[PDB]
Amino acid sequence: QDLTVKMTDLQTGKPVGTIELSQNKYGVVFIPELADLTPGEHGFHIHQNGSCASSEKDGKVVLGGAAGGHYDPEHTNKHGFPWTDDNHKGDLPALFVSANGLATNPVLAPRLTLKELKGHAIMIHAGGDNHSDMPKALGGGGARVACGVIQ
């Protein structure tokens, strides 16, 4: 059970690499092979809808907005950690990008199964992720910068 997800930069429209998804006894491991991202920690989540298209809100374009919100099959309406249950099941560990713009550090989501991920989107945000809705909603990820649909 391994899936390859192609990731595209939402602003440039160009490919930025792939993430390999694998099932193990401890959860789903996301192994990135990405480039052209800003150095530092990036919010990283499964979103509800199988699209990376834009949406609009109050007359403003939202890149990657068609993916909807964080994947939340238990209707928690809360953003949190990958190892806490009363928040979005889509909440992954943050994605690290090296000084050279590459992301290669794999991370584990203990609460997810690979089977439930088909048809959802993987999102990488501009900001980081403090795994809280304070002081900024949704961990402070802010804008969506790269996205791919899980097939």
Can you spell out the DSSP letters for 92-118?
-PPEEE-TTS-B---EEETT--SGGGT
Determine contact, residues 130/140, Cβ cutoff 8 Å: yes
Question: Does 123 help bind Cu ion (rule: CB under 5 A)?
Answer: yes
Nearest residue (CB) to its own copies, 101 versus 119? 101
Question: Does 45 help bind Cu ion (rule: CB under 5 A)?
Answer: yes
How far apart CA 85 and CA 75 sit, in angstroms, is 11
Question: Does 26 help bind its own copies (rule: CB under 8 A)?
Answer: yes
Nearest distance from C-beta of residue 139 to Zn ion, angstroms:
7
Question: Does 88 help bind Cu ion (rule: CB under 5 A)?
Answer: no
How far apart CA 72 and CA 15 sit, in angstroms, is 27
Q: Give contact residues for its own copies (rule: CB under 8 A).
A: 24-27, 29, 40-41, 81-84, 93-94, 96, 98-99, 105-108, 110-111, 131
